[PDB]
Amino acid sequence: MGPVWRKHYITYRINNYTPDMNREDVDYAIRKAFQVWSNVTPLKFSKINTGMADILVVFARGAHGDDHAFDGKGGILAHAFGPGSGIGGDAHFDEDEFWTTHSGGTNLFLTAVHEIGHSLGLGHSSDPKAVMFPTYKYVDINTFRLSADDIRGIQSLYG
Ligand SMILES: NC(=O)[C@H](CCC(=O)O)NC(=O)[C@H](CCC(=O)O)NC(=O)CCc1ccc(-c2cc(-c3ccccc3)cs2)cc1
Ligand SMILES: [Ca+2]
Ligand SMILES: [Ca+2]
Ligand SMILES: [Ca+2]
Ligand SMILES: [Zn+2]
Ligand SMILES: [Zn+2]
């Protein structure tokens, strides 16, 4: 078992916005991604603009201040740290990707669901049906559902 948040009220802050999308769409993608996970756990997520935000959402490129540099367009899309203080919980998105609300470029919502999974303490799944599976694939956002493996995973951490 990986680290878990020791509380059920979790704050996030969007540190900065990708120029790829309009700010409202980024807000929406991230809010919906958190909702995916709160729907199956006791966790609640609230957005703040400063202070002790647990999960900082960041768009950055290349070497961006942690020991996990990005790689330009393609390859690594994003990464996140497991629960913990400071950088713990933070989710970083490679600005060298083209972030979208849709199937073109890289879908932000789907990517954030995966990354928030990490921010909550989940590792990768070997189940190709699970959002925690290591590789990106676009699926109809309107019919997207957490797999039973994802639900198993997150419910093993929070109840
Ligand atoms: N390897 C790839 O296919 C793509 C893009 C390829 C390219 O442009 O270079 N890159 C990535 O996949 C990199 C891997 C980097 C590496 O280890 O090499 N992954 C990462 O950057 C991790 C981030 C991440 C992982 C998974 C997803 C998605 C899962 C689903 C889904 C929905 C329902 C059921 C099952 C799955 C929809 S989307 C989104 C974001
Ligand atoms: Ca943090
Ligand atoms: Ca990349
Ligand atoms: Ca970009
Ligand atoms: Zn990073
Ligand atoms: Zn991952």
Swiss-Prot record:
Tissue: Found in alveolar macrophages but not in peripheral blood monocytes.
Sequence positions that bind Ca(2+) 1: 20, 95, 97
Subcellular location: Secreted, Extracellular space, Extracellular matrix
Range within the parent protein: 106 to 263 of 470
Binding site for Zn(2+) 1: 64, 66, 79, 92
Induction: By exposure to bacterial lipopolysaccharides (LPS). Inhibited by dexamethasone.
Annotated active site: 115
Residues annotated as binding Ca(2+) 3: 71-72, 74, 76, 94, 97
Protein known as: Macrophage metalloelastase
